[PDB]
């Protein structure tokens, strides 16, 4: 079309995540700081949610994966492992089309499954519960590792898989998503029962081969992961090249919309042609990935959208956590105007971030929505990710109780009051002391709430002997006049005092000011949204 119609109620695949491989044996481990850059979200981090690791044929090297894998699990990431060869007493040589090749010996299948089981439990004993393990990396491009034919894989999936306990089983990790090596698994119910995820690589894979009708036909309840690629090349010092790097986002678009893949996993995380360079910083290829990985979190679903609404423009869209996300790619040489139409879901405003030849996730002005529709300018050779709060929704639990603390001493505006550090036990760099008996004040101007509603505002403060009353203002309106602050009993005894006030979903202000009687020493403020159904008395 021309309009990019985003059908929010027409659900597609459940997104599992985005990531890459750590390979200590071949390129060395990530350093501590690169782990954060890789698997944290928020500022200047890739937001990766999936970590792939090596299953070494030598079990005396298994220890090497633990440090990064633990950390990644602490950052909420999934972990899965891939073998290249079985142990070398399990392998025999043979001639395959003129070349000496390796395969798993036919009487050693049960033992190879025991070697995989042992990896899973070795990691479990060191605090890493694998989401999945794979039968073999690229069994159909194994010139340098161990080959399995479609029937060899099939035999193992029927007879030996699902004696794999402690995790999910993944197969066949074909190099080019070749259907011939997964078809046998899908067409056998007993082999199919033992497969939990169909993994595929996509090296050389044509757009038209991303579809897999048989998987649609017979694959309900199985996951579909794209477990290794790098694109469009492994050229030296290429990670920052533009517009070349834009092919990363196009490929991911293709994976998401043409292949309905739930996970997209890169080859080496840290590499000169990868998403993180050798200096530890995010490359232009890294940011292309970031456009999906940072905003399309695990648990989001893809939703139908006009995929190609103008010759060089590509659109995909996702829904989760009461948000719609849209990824729009203009591959062409001229900037384009693109209208987006939201259907079966609604928003008023839209945030957007854009990567191009001169910018990396640059924040653009909040543009807004009139009757489900909004237009936006997509620069030449750019990828733009849009984000918008959808109407009428919620999912809660505890829940917030997210708890957000704002210190009284920094990020604040003082009138006749000063920061001090005499009495200990304060959070932050100190506390604030009021100087005057009447109208010294502290004003927070940066209180940022997800939603409108009633907020509980807990003051942490110290007060030796008196009661000391404060007037309180929210957004310029006085909500309480001469609110008492009872003694804590000492300038070092920090107490708490909660009030209820109403605040918008944007940036708010809170102002406390003396009225006579001075004030207490003020440590910080904690602002929590009060749940619907809880306003108790
Ligand atoms: Ca004081
Ligand atoms: Ca403080």
UniProtKB/TrEMBL annotation:
GO terms for biological process: sphingolipid metabolic process; xylan catabolic process. GO terms for molecular function: carbohydrate binding; endo-1,4-beta-xylanase activity; glucosylceramidase activity; metal ion binding. It comes from the Bacteria. Keywords: Calcium, Carbohydrate metabolism, Glycosidase, Hydrolase, Metal-binding, Polysaccharide degradation, Signal, Xylan degradation. It is an enzyme of class 3 (hydrolase). Ca(2+) 1 binds at residues 407, 409, 427, 430, 523. The keyword Hydrolase applies. One of its GO terms (cellular component) is membrane. InterPro entries: CBM6 (IPR005084), Galactose-bd-like_sf (IPR008979), GH (IPR017853), Glyco_hydro_30 (IPR001139), Glyco_hydro_b (IPR013780). Beta-D-glucuronate binds at residues 404, 450-451, 455, 527. Alpha-D-glucuronate binds at residues 420, 423, 468, 521. It holds the Pfam family CBM_6. Ca(2+) 2 binds at residues 433-434, 518. Its EC number is 3.2.1.8. Belongs to the glycosyl hydrolase 30 family. This is Glucuronoarabinoxylan endo-1,4-beta-xylanase. It comes from Paenibacillus barcinonensis. The gene is xyn30d.
